[PDB]
Symmetry: C4
Subunit: 206 residues, 4 copies
């Protein structure tokens, strides 16, 4: 674990996240668990201007290194890490389809077998609270108790995994599931779903 290799990967994740079309508009933030705190993207610097030197470190007490301002949404990354001790990377964005489903304040049900990737038969939707607020942190910490990803009402998506690319994958996969959901929901409501049992089998094979 070297501070700079981790910093390079974070910028690469931010770039790749723009490449898949998850980033752009409000823009997300990425972080990796590090030492006692975490390394997180800074607030207000477009991925283009980013460099290893812009990545900020927040320790265990929420104290960030002097002269650097972490993401304005840094509080819930810590809630992510505290809630899922197995997570080493948190990716947060305001991707279009995820955000739209959270505007309807709905969980995404087992419409496709890959939903097992988040750890169960659903992608939850955490209740609304002002961004960067402590109450929002509880909402998300509670949602990630049993799921690796959650939607944030009238907000976006937050997904975590053991490393950055698996976290990016998950986040990207949740956009896909969100889009399949919106698309079929506009034709039939409720949308057909796989039973909990089939999901159990898939979870088994995963």
């Amino acid at each position: 674990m070297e501070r700079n290799k981790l910093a390079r990967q974070i910028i690469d994740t931010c770039l790749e996240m723009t490449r898949l079309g998850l980033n752009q508009g409000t823009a997300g933030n990425v972080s990796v668990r590090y030492q006692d705190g975490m390394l997180i993207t800074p607030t207000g610097i477009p991925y283009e201007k980013l460099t290893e030197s812009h990545i900020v470190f927040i320790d265990g007490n929420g104290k960030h290194e002097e002269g650097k301002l972490p993401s304005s949404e840094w509080r819930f990354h810590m809630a992510a890490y505290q809630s899922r001790p197995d997570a080493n990377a948190v990716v947060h964005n305001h991707a279009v389809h995820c955000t739209a489903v959270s505007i309807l304040n709905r969980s995404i049900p087992a419409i496709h077998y890959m939903i097992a990737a988040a750890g169960g038969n659903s992608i939850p939707c955490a209740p609304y609270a002002t961004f960067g607020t402590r109450e929002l942190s509880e909402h998300v910490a509670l949602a990630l108790k049993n799921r690796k990803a959650t939607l944030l009402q009238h907000h976006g998506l937050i997904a975590c995994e053991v490393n950055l690319e698996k976290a990016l994958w998950l986040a990207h996969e949740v956009e896909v599931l969100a889009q399949l959901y919106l698309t079929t929901l506009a034709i039939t409501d409720p949308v057909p779903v796989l039973s909990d049992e089939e999901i159990a089998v898939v979870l088994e094979k995963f």
Copy 2:
């Protein structure tokens, strides 16, 4: 403030606007406040052929330099500048989702907290008037009185900010909000929204 640095930035904005997919089809126009008038993109020259020498200057009386024809939609950029004395850059386009919402002649309500970026709890929709017409100018001037962005009925979007990239961001952000609106509107009407008060809090934190 150097005429040519500003001209280069305008072409870059036009290029970037095509990159985000806002431009193309009818095509937009960009301008920056300058001296007593403004520097605006010329009518009928695809971003590709553009150069610093094509950027036209219109003074305070609406007089443009000889041999150059400004954008056919130059009149409402002036209405933008006159209405918002704090705006130094106006970006206008006919982006797909913004235009679709203006076809329904609806304002975009507080469906996501970022709507506070336009200065309030909504993105208005100005009434229709022929393009390049003076009546259209009033409609837009009235809409931008209290908002940094407005939709134009059966037309498109017009957004302004203190500089070009913030204006481009806003314009891009309004497309996102427009798309979240259409998507959820096709499933439920009315779409859930944040109360004016929550918006007030966000405006506070912004």
Copy 3:
């Protein structure tokens, strides 16, 4: 008018058409009026393998040069040229949104002022007939009598103008109008439209 400059432009149009996302899937065909016949893209050669030598010439009697097979849809390009003597370039594709509207067998009404670009207050939809059939030719010739573009039922789009880039623009603009149509149609039917008179004014300013 040099056979090879025209051939290079056609391949460029085919490439650009793929770039805007109009081409791909079934794939389109482009042609330019030439001498007594026309120069048209050949059947079954992906834009990538294309070269000036693949562009085929069909004379006035429908006879093509030996050893080269023109587009399987060459018959209606001739109907385009015969119907609109002012057209020097025909672009045909099976773009997604245009094709979807033609599946509903609906004309696109005056939902946006740019519809005047096709020459009136609507984009018609020609009746169905097997592709490469002579009856299909009449359907399209009749539709282009008074419009520069037309949709083909359960088929796609065909647009013409005085040169290739204006034809490409139009075709691209019709996809935009098609998409605005589908999007608002899924929320309200009928979709609000500009009166014939407003269109008349726009036609005047165009």
Copy 4:
């Protein structure tokens, strides 16, 4: 037929499949009939890291070469080859629009004349069974009896042809048909379709 030329083409297909936007999210798998077995993409290696050496060979008894793990979905490629003895390439993905239609568990009817490309007047939808399961193999083998492509319920798409690019084309064409279907279905249900007879004519001209 050289093992390595085939391996290079498979990686190129995987890359191109990402380029059209079919791949990404769950990710697909490609294979080519080879000797007594087939050459298939390996499980868990992003197209970027892929190389000729990662392509795995499974013989006729389902035995794969030591030290290499084939795609977790290799069983139904064999069902593809056994069902369609004329197929030499199978492309499988979880493309967005195909998957959404299979979530509704609907076949795609003759909404556009190109549907004849799959061999008839429809694109079927095979019933659900756990991935990599033998029962899923029967479902797909039965569906491909008379069609070159089939959708897999709550899963994705599987298309085959005589070679890789024709298989890629078909797969891409099915996404298009899937999208035209969803789009018009959200406005009218049932969506207008061409009669079996018209399809017969097209099949004739194909």
